[PDB]
Structures are given as C-alpha cells and as structure tokens.
Design a protein around this ligand. Structure first.
Ligand code: ZN
Length: 258
C-alpha cells in the first residue's frame, strides 16, 4: 500500500508519510504573472541537448519516465538562475483526464492539459541520490502542454506507450531527441521548490517556461490509455497524476522577461 493520486492515497494524504509535504518550499505553485518580478540579472537559459542519450522508457506506476545516460556531461542545463552545471537524467509528464486540467504549476490559476518535467541534477554532487539531499541539487525545466496542433517531436514517445501500459513495464527507447519537445522561446519564471511526488524533497530550482507547446488531442488521448496498475491487476487509467498548487509562503517568483 502507498501513495498515489486516488481518493484515499492522493496528495492530501501524502503529509502523513511525508511530513515535508507541508513544508516551506513545496511545489508546484500558482505563478501570478503580475506579482512575478522581472530580474534583469537573470541570464539566458542554456539548454544543451545535442549529445543527449536516451536509453529507456519506464511506467513507474505514477507516470512514465524517459531515461537518459547521465554518466557523462552530454545533455546539460546551465545559466538562467543556475550556478554550475545540471545533467539531464529523465523527463516525464503530468496530465489530466480532461484537457482542462493536468498541469501542476498554474499561471494566474489557469491549468494546462499537461506539464512536461525535464529533471536535471547538479554535477557538483556526483549523483542524483546525493543531489536530492541538497537545496540546490536539482533543476527541473517545466513546460506546459496545451491541446491543438500535434507536436511532431512527441510522437515517438506516444507510439511506444502501448508497450509500457502497466506499472513496472519498460522498453528500449534510444536516440530520442528532447529538443523536439521545446517551445520556441526560453523565457521563464523561476523559484525555489521541491519534487512534486514523494519524497517531496526541497531540492529543486524550478524553471518554468512561459511558452507552452501544443500537442494534439490524439497524442494526449494516448497518455490517458496508460495504467497506474500493474499487469493482471484491475485497470485504473493513469490520468490526473498531478499535485495541485501549494502555498507560496516566503518565496518570490522571478521572471527572465519584461
Ligand atoms: Zn514531475
């Protein structure tokens, strides 16, 4: 038995096992665009994915992760509000049962159909496990998804989902280029936060892009065919695997644009 996104084990229950759920820098949050302050000291983000090496795609019971080889400096995130170099380890999404919900972060209370999270860890800490124990251990690039035109670069991901329908299933997923999932503009909002799933560690520098990417209804429909359950257990569609906005508390959201 364990945490999930159901009535009995969902986000409002997480604090019992993970008391930090009620902490001082929890994610996600609502981004109030009018209250976010432009910070002209913020540098342009540096997204260097040319040598990215995807390996595998996994249904872990809460979402699906596209994993990358992070044993060398190959896909890295630098600049922006970041000091140092962060290595891409995996990306995953959060989505809803309906196009009107699914994103974790919200913009002026607006919920997008889904949200992509490209997770990177700070190379100064040697590995992901050690990085999550540090306040500046991770950098997660969040990108909103809206339903409209299809995202060509996402199709390869969607077509493999049938092979990892249930919890615990994985499939080879090599040569996937995450650059095909990035919007045109890299304008962003940034604030100190946490993982949005248990253990909910407060180790993340969040970088959320202003510009959403568009995906087709057919593409998101396929996300909704995945299962939270394992093979041979009652089908529970993997939908609404998003944590709602948490109190901003003593934090300021900064914008890289005016
Ligand atoms: Zn996430």
């Amino acid at each position: 038995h364990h945490w999930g996104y159901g009535k009995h084990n969902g986000p409002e229950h997480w604090h019992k096992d993970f008391p930090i759920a009620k902490g001082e820098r929890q994610s996600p949050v609502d981004i109030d665009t009018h209250t976010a302050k432009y910070d002209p000291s913020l540098k342009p983000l540096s997204v260097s994915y040319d040598q990215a090496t995807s390996l595998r795609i996994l249904n872990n019971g809460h979402a699906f992760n596209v994993e990358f080889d992070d044993s060398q400096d190959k896909a890295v995130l630098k600049g922006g509000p970041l000091d140092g170099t962060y290595r891409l380890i995996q990306f995953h999404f959060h989505w809803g049962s309906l196009d009107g919900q699914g994103s974790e972060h919200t913009v002026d209370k607006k919920k997008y159909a889904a949200e992509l999270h490209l997770v990177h860890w700070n190379t100064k800490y040697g590995d992901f496990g050690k990085a999550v124990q540090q306040p500046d251990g991770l950098a997660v690039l969040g990108i909103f998804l809206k339903v409209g035109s299809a995202k060509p670069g996402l199709q390869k991901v969607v077509d493999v989902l049938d092979s990892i329908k249930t919890k615990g299933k994985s499939a080879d997923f090599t040569n996937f280029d995450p650059r095909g999932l990035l919007p045109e503009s890299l304008d962003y909002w940034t604030y100190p936060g946490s993982l949005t799933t248990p253990p909910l560690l407060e180790c993340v520098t969040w970088i959320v892009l202003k510009e959403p990417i568009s995906v087709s209804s057919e593409q998101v429909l396929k996300f909704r065919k995945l299962n939270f359950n394992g093979e041979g257990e009652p089908e529970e569609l993997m939908v609404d695997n998003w944590r709602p906005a948490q109190p901003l508390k003593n934090r300021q959201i900064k914008a890289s644009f005016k």
